[model samples]
Target chain A: QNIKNLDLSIELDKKMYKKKLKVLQYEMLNAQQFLLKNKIGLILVFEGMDAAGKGGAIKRLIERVDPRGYVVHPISAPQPHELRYNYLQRFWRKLPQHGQIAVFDRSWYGRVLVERIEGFATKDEWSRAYEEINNFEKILTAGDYIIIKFWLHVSDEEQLKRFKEREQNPYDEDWRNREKSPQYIEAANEMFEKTDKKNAPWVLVAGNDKKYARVQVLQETLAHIEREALKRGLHL
Target chain B: MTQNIKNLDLSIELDKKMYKKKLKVLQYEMLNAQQFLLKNKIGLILVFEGMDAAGKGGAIKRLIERVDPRGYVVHPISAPQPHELRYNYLQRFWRKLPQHGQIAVFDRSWYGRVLVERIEGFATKDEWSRAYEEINNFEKILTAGDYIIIKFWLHVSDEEQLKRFKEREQNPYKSWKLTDEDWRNREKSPQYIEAANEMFEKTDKKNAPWVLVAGNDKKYARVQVLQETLAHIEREALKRGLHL
Candidate 1:
């Protein structure tokens, strides 16, 4: 389904979000232990527009889980040395071994999203990256990796409001990115359609309301962890 | 058919005068070709593997003598550390690969999985057996990028190896190179030969082929390493249409 048409008006009461969040975090801690005991790997990918509460959701998600079980990589533009090798080489090195968890604040999706719009990658390069990315996911999952991708959807109006709240210049890069919202949405839609596989599917979160998105993220993560564990004939 | 390591001609020798004269040209040519590689942003990888006291260090010294230090990195591969053993065996090697316009010289490399680790019983049958395909795919990925791979197997006769061992024992400075472990490995040369042959048959791909260097004559093998290094980089420059 196209992300532009996704309903972004969803909301939740602070009291209700707090209540649900505690339960989800409790279950997540248990799931972490189960993964460590079973020697399974969990990779979490968070992708969205600026001010989509990615950091906030991640902060709450890991609040209760043991610190030793996970690592968070906030992916940005490649460093000089990183650009020397293949685009995916850095990510490949960051993959968690079995019984560990890796959380990517942003990920390789930048190749299609920001890089595509900004002409950082040529037509042939970015166009062929879909298959390359798919193969990468296949390679990881072929081992003990379980991938969960999240695309937090924030409407332009809400995005600008959050940007103002954070004291970011509305007329700066954020404003410029907002001007390119249609292009970003189109790229995001194509990314979902192309690289979204059964082994690693995307979970779209309505992120207009902060309370709603944060709780939804924790709930969805807990559900996915339980579902994946149950699929392996283990109960948590 | 795999080239039998035991039967390879290890008697090729170079006269001192001819060796010194040709060595100067080969090293100079390597430095020249390396600049073009940097300009063209092509990576060069040289892997040296063979028995103990096979003159790998000597050959590497001469190979990089004339080249700029910034253009290359030499990774001397050894047993994995405690933490490194936890990840995929290929993970450690992947982290050592050269970036664009650089050279990576591996004294010994991932082939240890099939050679020493296979013969020493450090790796399981399934692990070493599966390493053939894993290494092939790893090289394929590198070649798909702009990197050029050149692997060498320096061969020395058992008699010559024993002579060097005795010589090292007499030379106080070089004596540290010999150990009781070297003697142990010498006794298992037959198993090593079989393992080397299997490796050549399985991993000698067109993109990353095995070059067998005759090491009985140290000067000859040293010159051969430089000649091969010059030839591969110059050939890669020609293929990439980069002017040197």
Candidate 2:
């Protein structure tokens, strides 16, 4: 089944999650060392609905990694200068050098998701983005890069609860987007259908439980790095 | 033989009356092209590289004379700053590339890696050697993103260059342009010429063909630069289905 139909209720016990999280974080440090020594680059992309815990998961992922070797790019609406080029131009400028990691919080996928749903991008523009984005990822992987994409999915009920919890510092756009959740889901599902390649696969995280989702993101990242390392004839 | 710098013909001359009319006509056409490029969201980069007194500044001045100031920028690149040395040589250039609907003119560009950096023993042999392929890949990325790149190499005879150098040395306002570095570079023109020929052979792709302009006659070189630039822009616009 596709991502939109995933069971968001899957969770973990608080004690079990804590135990697994520390182990995964320690393993992540080991992976980072391996990456630096081998001169391999890693790109971790996060895309999901608002209140889907992208920032929370990214916070945990990079918190354990060395600051010198990693850069976190929090992408928002394109600025006037950024909008002047193709959507991928700014992202290309941010690509990781060898032996480094680039973490993108909401990335080029915006062309298909929010831009498509909100009519910011024309039909022709968003329609052709899937292939353009896939080719871009292919170029990176052909170089010394490994890309890991994560979509932290949460139910409407869970998102509503999270929104209320942060009521003191409310975001107007989040409320506006909550009203169009159905459209976002449809667009996201289409994005998944088009962009889910074997080389750089998307990992759908059941994010209703923040602890479970955080732990899973780390675990999958470590696993992907190890898997690719073995294929490249590296013992990890 | 290939288009070597020394083999360029420096005999083309321009009449005073005809030069002014052609220059204004090309500049007006260039202005229209800029507006069309803006509407179509296309990027244009004009790169100039040549000897010390090869008339690059004069050619560039006439090229942008009629274009809107807001739509273009001129980057007079010098030696890299201390902070710029931290990254790869190409990094600084990538940061300065034009956005869509904008034009960027480089008085002297990344070719310095192979020219001065190679002749002056600044970059290591391995570092400068690999830049040919590196620069080709860089231009490929820009072309795929709808950037129209026009590279020009202005050339002049040793005698003509010295004449202009002596002219600049005597004129108070223009004497500031003369420097010891220019004389030093001229002494090593043989090595720079060889480096440029290699650059022409390697990085000159079909997408970004290099235009070699003979600059003994300043008026002729300026008019030729504008003519070639306007022609390339129109060619790209026509290929992209943008009617101008």
Candidate 3:
């Protein structure tokens, strides 16, 4: 999921942007009904490497959806109460009901991603969570849920450029932790390799071109749901 | 202290024309006090619970319209999600508790265990009755955690509640709020009265006192809550010798 493999030199043509986005919106609106009818819930995990424009993608997704129908849960770390329960406890409590879509800015994957590498979880704990997560996703998929994992990757050089050109602010230190860590890259490599399943496949986005990245996600989402419907003999 | 099974007479009439003058003054003071609290990194928790149509939402909306959005979060507590129910009753609330320099507003509170859950028998006799001591200690812990806890029970007369419910039913924007359940709960006023008074007797210690607002008068209650919040913050600020 590191950005060395993703080139950000691409740009989206904004000439027909609003018109094109509207078409996708209409498609999404119609797809919502098909999803609800089939009792298919969708969970979109939007965890990207830092300086990867994860926030922008989320803001774009929110703008495209109606608030009443969908929800964006901004995930923070496990609080004290939650840590007592299984790591997935809070996510389970907050998961969307049938006929709903949930966009989690982060998820239990942080167990391996941050907690594992950051020494918050013991090695054995993060080690076994791979099987635990795969099982969770398998159950959700079998129950007619579509789980989409997005790995938004922008190169270190590109991110550095963006950071240099952009004004330095309060979040710089935290952002830099993600920017400079080979440990993070190592963790990402391990995570993406082992947990990349058929049903819950991770889509690595070329995020240097973030505007196009947003568009790519929306189109890919529509196309993904359409294919899921086809697989279930359901119609759009 | 228990109330007789009779109507409780409570009402207040605010001068509608003069409300704007009072509102502006209080709002400015509240805004100032909130800024000071932020600078001091003092977390604030405002808990409100009352009968339906008791003007809780209206009062909250006024308070929220003044505070900076970045520093405050309003949580309208309802039935717990299934996983939330599996944990300790207060677990979900702990997660929403304010961070330092932030404010968390709760529309209904954990008081439900002593109020609704107690009345509706959703909790065991052991459970609902067990909560009062637990809740009292919870506030103590919150204060120790450096959170300023302010609570309000919007006290509207029965006649006042009926009048407001009907008025809400007429307002197209607010019509959805006057549900059949609100009407059903109105009949449980006596039990609620008994339960609420018990709440006051037990939890009204120095650190977190419950201010039973004269909510029949919306303007007055709004000003009263704002003033109380400002005064508490200002008093605490002075005791600590905080500048501005």
Winning model by TM-score = 1
lDDT, candidate 1, residue B200? 87
TM-score of each: 0.81, 0.71, 0.50
Model 3, span B184-219: residue lDDT tens: 999998899888887877777667767777788888
True lDDT of residue B103, candidate 2: 97
After superposing candidate 3, which stretches have Cα over 4 Å from the reference?
Answer: A1-236, B1-10, B13-16
For residues A137-197, what per-residue lDDT tens digits would candidate 2 score against the true structure? 7656755789989988888899999888889675578898899988888888888898888
lDDT of 2 by residue, B1-244 (tens): 6654446555555447698789889999889989988888899999999888899999998999999999999999886676655445665787788888899999999988888888888878976787787777677667766799989999988999999999999999997766799988888988888898899888887678798888888988999999898888887777777777
* Model 1: per-residue Cα lDDT over B1-244, one tens digit each: 4554546654655446688888998898889878878887888889999988888999999999999998899998986676876565667777887888899999999999998999988788977887787777677667656888989998888888898889889998987766699899999998998998899888887788788888988888999898777777666666667656
lDDT of 3 at B203: 79
User: Candidate 3 clashing pairs?
Assistant: none
User: Which candidate leads in DockQ?
Assistant: 1
The whole-model C-alpha lDDT of candidate 1 against the native structure comes to 0.83
Write down the lDDT that model 2 would get.
0.84
**How do these models rank on TM-score, best leading?**
1, 2, 3
lDDT tens string, model 1, A1-236? 54556655555456677788888888788888998898888999999989888998998888899999899999997778788987777987998878898999999988898889999877867897787777667656655678889988887788878878788554467778889988988998999889888778788888888778888888777778777778888877
